[PDB]
Amino acid sequence: NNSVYTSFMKSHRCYDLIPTSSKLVVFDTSLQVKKAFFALVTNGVRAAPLWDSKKQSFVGMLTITDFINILHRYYKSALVQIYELEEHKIETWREVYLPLVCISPNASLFDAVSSLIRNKIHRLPVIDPESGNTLYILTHKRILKFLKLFITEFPKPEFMSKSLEELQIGTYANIAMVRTTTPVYVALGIFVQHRVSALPVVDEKGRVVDIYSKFDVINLAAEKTYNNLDVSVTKALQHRSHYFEGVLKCYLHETLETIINRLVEAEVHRLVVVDENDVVKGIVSLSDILQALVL
Amino acid sequence: GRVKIGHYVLGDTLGVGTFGKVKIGEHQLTGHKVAVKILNRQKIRSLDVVGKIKREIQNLKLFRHPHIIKLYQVISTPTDFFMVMEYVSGGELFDYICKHGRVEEMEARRLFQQILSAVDYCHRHMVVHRDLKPENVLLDAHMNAKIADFGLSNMMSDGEFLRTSCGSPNYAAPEVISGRLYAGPEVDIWSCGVILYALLCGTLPFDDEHVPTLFKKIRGGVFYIPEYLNRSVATLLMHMLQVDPLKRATIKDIREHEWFKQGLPSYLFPEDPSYDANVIDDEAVKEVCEKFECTESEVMNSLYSGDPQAYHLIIDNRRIMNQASEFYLASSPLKPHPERMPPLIAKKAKWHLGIRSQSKPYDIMAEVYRAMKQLDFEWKVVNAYHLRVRRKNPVTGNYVKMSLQLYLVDNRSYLLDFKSIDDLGSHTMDFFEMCASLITTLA
Amino acid sequence: FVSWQQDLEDSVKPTQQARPTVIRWSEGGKEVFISGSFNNWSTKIPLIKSHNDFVAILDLPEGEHQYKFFVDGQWVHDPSEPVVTSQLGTINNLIHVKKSDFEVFDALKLDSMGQEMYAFRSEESPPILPPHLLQVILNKDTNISCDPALLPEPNHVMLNHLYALSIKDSVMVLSATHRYKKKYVTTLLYKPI
Ligand SMILES: OC[C@H]1O[C@@H]2O[C@H]3[C@H](O)[C@@H](O)[C@@H](O[C@H]4[C@H](O)[C@@H](O)[C@@H](O[C@H]5[C@H](O)[C@@H](O)[C@@H](O[C@H]6[C@H](O)[C@@H](O)[C@@H](O[C@H]7[C@H](O)[C@@H](O)[C@@H](O[C@H]8[C@H](O)[C@@H](O)[C@@H](O[C@H]1[C@H](O)[C@H]2O)O[C@@H]8CO)O[C@@H]7CO)O[C@@H]6CO)O[C@@H]5CO)O[C@@H]4CO)O[C@@H]3CO
Numbered sequence A: 001n002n003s004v005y006t007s008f009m010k011s012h013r014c015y016d017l018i019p020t021s022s023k024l025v026v027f028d029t030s031l032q033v034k035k036a037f038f039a040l041v042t043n044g045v046r047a048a049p050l051w052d053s054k055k056q057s058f059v060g061m062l063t064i065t066d067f068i069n070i071l072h073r074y075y076k077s078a079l080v081q082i083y084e085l086e087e088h089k090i091e092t093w094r095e096v097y098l099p100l101v102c103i104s105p106n107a108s109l110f111d112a113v114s115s116l117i118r119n120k121i122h123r124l125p126v127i128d129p130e131s132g133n134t135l136y137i138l139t140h141k142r143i144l145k146f147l148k149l150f151i152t153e154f155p156k157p158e159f160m161s162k163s164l165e166e167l168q169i170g171t172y173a174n175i176a177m178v179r180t181t182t183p184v185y186v187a188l189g190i191f192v193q194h195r196v197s198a199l200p201v202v203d204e205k206g207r208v209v210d211i212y213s214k215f216d217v218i219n220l221a222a223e224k225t226y227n228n229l230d231v232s233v234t235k236a237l238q239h240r241s242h243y244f245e246g247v248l249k250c251y252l253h254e255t256l257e258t259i260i261n262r263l264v265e266a267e268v269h270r271l272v273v274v275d276e277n278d279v280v281k282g283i284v285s286l287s288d289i290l291q292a293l294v295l
Numbered sequence B: 001g002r003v004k005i006g007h008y009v010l011g012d013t014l015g016v017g018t019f020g021k022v023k024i025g026e027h028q029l030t031g032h033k034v035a036v037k038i039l040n041r042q043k044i045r046s047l048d049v050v051g052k053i054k055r056e057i058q059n060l061k062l063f064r065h066p067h068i069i070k071l072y073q074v075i076s077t078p079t080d081f082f083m084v085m086e087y088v089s090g091g092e093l094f095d096y097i098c099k100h101g102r103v104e105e106m107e108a109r110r111l112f113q114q115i116l117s118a119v120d121y122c123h124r125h126m127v128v129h130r131d132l133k134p135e136n137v138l139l140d141a142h143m144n145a146k147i148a149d150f151g152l153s154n155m156m157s158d159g160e161f162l163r164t165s166c167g168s169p170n171y172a173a174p175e176v177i178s179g180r181l182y183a184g185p186e187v188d189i190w191s192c193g194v195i196l197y198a199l200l201c202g203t204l205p206f207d208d209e210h211v212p213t214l215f216k217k218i219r220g221g222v223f224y225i226p227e228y229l230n231r232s233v234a235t236l237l238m239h240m241l242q243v244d245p246l247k248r249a250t251i252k253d254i255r256e257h258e259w260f261k262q263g264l265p266s267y268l269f270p271e272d273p274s275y276d277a278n279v280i281d282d283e284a285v286k287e288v289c290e291k292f293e294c295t296e297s298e299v300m301n302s303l304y305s306g307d308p309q310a311y312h313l314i315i316d317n318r319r320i321m322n323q324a325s326e327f328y329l330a331s332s333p334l335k336p337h338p339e340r341m342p343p344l345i346a347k348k349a350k351w352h353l354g355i356r357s358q359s360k361p362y363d364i365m366a367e368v369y370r371a372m373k374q375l376d377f378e379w380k381v382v383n384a385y386h387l388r389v390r391r392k393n394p395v396t397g398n399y400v401k402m403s404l405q406l407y408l409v410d411n412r413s414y415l416l417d418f419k420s421i422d423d424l425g426s427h428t429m430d431f432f433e434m435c436a437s438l439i440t441t442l443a
Numbered sequence C: 001f002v003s004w005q006q007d008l009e010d011s012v013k014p015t016q017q018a019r020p021t022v023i024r025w026s027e028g029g030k031e032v033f034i035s036g037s038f039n040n041w042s043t044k045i046p047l048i049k050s051h052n053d054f055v056a057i058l059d060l061p062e063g064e065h066q067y068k069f070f071v072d073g074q075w076v077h078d079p080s081e082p083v084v085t086s087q088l089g090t091i092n093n094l095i096h097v098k099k100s101d102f103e104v105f106d107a108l109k110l111d112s113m114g115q116e117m118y119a120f121r122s123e124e125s126p127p128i129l130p131p132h133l134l135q136v137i138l139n140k141d142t143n144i145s146c147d148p149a150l151l152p153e154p155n156h157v158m159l160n161h162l163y164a165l166s167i168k169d170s171v172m173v174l175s176a177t178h179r180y181k182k183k184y185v186t187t188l189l190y191k192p193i
């Protein structure tokens, strides 16, 4: 009775999250990894599941994280070509890098959110047991957007109107960040080291100016500028300069209901927090909010 | 003591349809009047209409619309089938256009709003009434449109085009008179456009003595526009009666029109009570979700009548999910979405239907046969261009089935189509593996 | 309101109230009568007259019953319908009633009146392509504001039809729309030749 957020899940199936008409891309493990990242750009999809013709079943999941992992490992310099990226296939690199992690459409929402937290992943694909084919790729952004639709009819409790200072949601300490002069290669290294979706571009004084997420890496493949990672993060984010309405930042004296409403309207994954004046402060992501909603 | 069925005394004949005759039905005890369609079982068995009659009975029971003839009961006897349905005292619309002349712009609009509401209801339940005409459209004492004679109606199958052609040369779309493949809704809109012209003008837009010149007028799509009807209604008739099926108006186009929007009642096109709109059932899948969560299937059947208790709460939740369009569906033509990817630097690639050929159709058939014989394929030749290939997967051990059909784009242009047939391995993926194996072998 | 209407239909349970039999004959005779085994050939049931057809409804029980018509003082049976030879001499028309339920009856009717898994070449104009297939949902462009993975509602005919893009490179691209659980999914496949 006290937990109304948990009752929204478990009772509702995974099928309700899947849209009426969607676009899904599938890559065969036999094709080149360089052509696969260039294919994600042309189709506009963030992630795509992998298929094995020999096994006749889905083995992996191709994300932008794989494109980040390749570069740190194989990038030599702006002069020497990355001979690995062009020659490597989807199957060959899969053997170098480290069971199928998926969910059922008939299965509960509570079992789907727990799968994203336990396995420590952002993209979880849903496969029909009777059919055998992929239907949709579940994201933390889609789950919270689905919640904001059904939660409007339900009255929010006392903890839903609690401030960021009073609540324990969000990793307050040891936040990883980049500077305006920090190169792409150094920035990409942090994505593999600390293993976080977003990296905030902070000025030498301590002011947050930009944000370099895993999505901003696909621009190196879109413009074919992946061969030069020596250039600063500001030059890598120069493409959005004309069409960008500033960085999303909230305050510590703001209620949880206002924070959740800010993320769905902006459609962003990680939300930066600053106090009094723009300053470094702990970053709060959808993975922290969804984990708090479960327990 | 005249002929009686079920407390109902049969009288005067209303008319004779494509199959059987309809006779007036009069109650002996009360005096209630019904229309009794008598379908002779022997005459139905003499032809292959036995399947079409079965679907017509199932569809009429499934429907629950105030502008469609309501079917009360189907009384079966060993000699013939009896269909007890809704009687309308006013008679056919065709007789009203002849007697009263051309109906006034506002009054004809109300009748057109009601007739289109019934056509829209049919399309929602995947049924297309191919024989739409003022002869088949009836009225009552209070003057309200009612669609009858579903003997020419056919189901809307996924990935199938119906080429069957209705007898009436008039009221039939340019694709029907040409005898070309089409999708169901487009014909019903063209059939509604000519009906809209019928009560507004009094005459037909495309009419001639001999059949060849009549077909030339329909294919041309040039119709007379009288001086009395306004600029708003004239634009609708032009959009409804188009030669091209893609350029033609749709159910959504007419509802968005300025002339149709006025005088439109609230009960005609409902959004929220659309789930309970169909009489026949709660969603079959929907019932199982309630069965797999709490109780065995067929549970609370008495309960559903009782109302004590549950499944209705799940169906009402589906209406809320269907209400928000932006979350479940994408709109085609605003601030840019954060997940939108920038264009790739080397031109946008364009998708196309299957594989195309310029050679003789006899040569393509010999080419697809020699390619199929190279692999372990097993089929069944239905038509000289239609094939149903089936290949067994060696890894999974499951049978994969797909359809093949040959079409022609232009005079010297030909096309080959691949269709998926639904039955460890993915069904959608196995169809792609079966397709790729044939495309790689062929040239 | 709507729920109540739907509920009322639900409450009803399918059944047939009465089980009658048609018994009709077409002739030009003014006085028509019929006698069978139901009344033990004691009384002659009068035929009501349609202007052309003659018909008289009688609630006969399930089983084999032999009846004979009498027109203008002459006992003559119906040729068009099946008949059986009686012990007396004359071959009277037989009426055999077992099932009178529309769904079951149709199937029995249905039962009355090319090769499974047999691959063979056929010997001795193709149909014109519908323009509804030419328009591709993947070629159609959506709003910049909405999600990229989201697509508009596709026409029912289009799905299950394979759409392939010309191969720039060795890799082959082919996609098809499929419907699951009243949900539509457009799956794309990237696989090299
Ligand atoms: O009356 C009942 C009877 O009505 C209808 O029959 C009419 C028929 O449709 C008309 O065409 C016409 O029939 C004439 C017929 O063509 C002539 O042949 C004549 O028949 C005579 C025979 O030629 C002669 O051989 C002899 O028949 C013997 C029978 O073969 C023999 O079986 C027996 O008769 C008795 C039966 O044994 C017994 O089973 C039982 O039969 C009864 C039937 O079971 C019952 O269905 C019913 O028949 C109907 C018939 O279906 C209608 O079409 O009644 C039957 C009688 O009760 O009882 C039989 C009693 O005879 O013995 C006889 C010899 O004694 O004689 C017959 C004439 O008696 O008859 C017609 C001359 O115009 O009219 C009949 C009218 O019945």
Ligand SMILES: Cc1ccc(Oc2nc3nc(-c4ccc(-c5ccccc5O)cc4)c(Cl)cc3[nH]2)cc1C(=O)O
Residues within 6 Å of the ligand: B002, B003, B010, B011, B012, B019, B020, B021, B023, B038, B039, B040, B080, C022, C024, C048, C049, C050, C051, C053, C054, C055
């Ligand atoms: C096109 C057709 C359809 C059905 C058919 O078979 C039947 N004709 C029938 N007529 C009748 C019938 C019987 C009585 C009356 C009737 C007679 C006097 C007064 C009022 C009446 O309703 C009208 C029709 C009945 Cl109940 C069943 C029939 N079954 C025969 C034909 C046909 O003419 O081939």
Ligand SMILES: Nc1ncnc2c1ncn2[C@@H]1O[C@H](COP(=O)(O)O)[C@@H](O)[C@H]1O
Residues within 6 Å of the ligand: A170, A171, A174, A175, A176, A177, A194, A195, A196, A197, A198, A199, A200, A269, A270, A283, A284, A285, A286, A287, A288
């Ligand atoms: N820039 C960042 N630096 C350090 N930690 C972060 C950052 N962004 C998010 N986190 C934390 O890392 C976890 C996973 O983040 P994410 O990959 O963004 O879902 C969450 O528990 C966050 O609190």
Ligand SMILES: Nc1ncnc2c1ncn2[C@@H]1O[C@H](COP(=O)(O)O)[C@@H](O)[C@H]1O
Residues within 6 Å of the ligand: A197, A198, A211, A212, A213, A214, A215, A216, A246, A247, A248, A249, A267, A268, A269, A270, A271, A272, B338, B339
């Ligand atoms: N707090 C934020 N403020 C502004 N833009 C953001 C923020 N978080 C993410 N983005 C952008 O939104 C896009 C997708 O973000 P993500 O869902 O984190 O991959 C990327 O292009 C980011 O640059």
